[PDB]
Amino acid sequence: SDEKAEKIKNLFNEVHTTGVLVIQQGQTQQSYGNDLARASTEYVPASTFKMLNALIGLEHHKATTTEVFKWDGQKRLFPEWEKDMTLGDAMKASAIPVYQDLARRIGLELMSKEVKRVGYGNADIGTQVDNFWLVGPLKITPQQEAQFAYKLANKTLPFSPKVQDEVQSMLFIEEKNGNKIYAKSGWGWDVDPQVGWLTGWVVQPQGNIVAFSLNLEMKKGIPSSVRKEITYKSLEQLGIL
């Protein structure tokens, strides 16, 4: 309804930024929030790109889910990143240096081919293999991110089913009221304006998949927890959680 839609718009209003939430069920998408035009606007994917990075890496055997990416000992952006980790550990922590390592393993030629083959966003990774998802040129819309998540959830992306299985496992967050929640956050803090993401899906008890992509502008005074916060209360308001 619009009872629901206005409640969701007001969620973005309270935190004094602009945002959109795209929801996909079956082949139908709906947009909510206080700036619906964001839904079809391109932004850098930031760490949401780890989903596809992992798919490509696993498909072509450039990494395994069990191997350990060693920490070289150099200081990193966050203390949580300063340890050895698996791709799954690094997915949960959004450990950028680990997935930059993976990107280099894949290499520019394979990465470009695969990004194009999948048709991800504007499918342009430029010439720098280990940051194209953080500062450009690669961009994607929230509509495309929601669709991507929906296909991943249904394992209809063009990768081996077991590879999609393994990446799903890395994205599992929690089980809430019988619903399984899968998600990947993103925060493009190296661009202006900063973009904040939460892309994922809900598996409801009977198996139905509800994909979503939250996209808003991150601002001073707006904590990163806002992404999951707004996403969850919006999903509760829509009766999905």
Cα separation of 105 and 98, whole Å?
11
Give the count of beta carbons closer than 10 Å to the beta carbon of residue 103: 24
Resolution (A): 2.0
The method of structure determination was X-ray
Q: CA angle 41-44-46, nearest 5°?
A: 135
Give the tokens for residue 20.
Answer: 């959109």
Architecture of domain 1-241: 3-Layer(aba) Sandwich (3.40)
How far apart CA 66 and CA 137 sit, in angstroms, is 31
Do residues 65 and 88 lie in contact, with contact meaning Cβ atoms separated by under 8 Å?
yes
Amino acid present at 99? Y
Distances (CA, A) of 146 to 103, 106, 124, 184, 231: 23, 25, 19, 11, 13
172 DSSP β-pair partners: 182
Of the candidates 1, 31, 47, 213, the residue annotated as catalytic is: 47
Q: Give the C-alpha distances (Å, rounded to integers) separating 64 from 121, 153, 184, 215.
A: 26, 20, 19, 30
47 is an active site residue: yes
| Structure token pair of residue 137 | 């040129």
Q: What is the DSSP letter of 73?
A: S
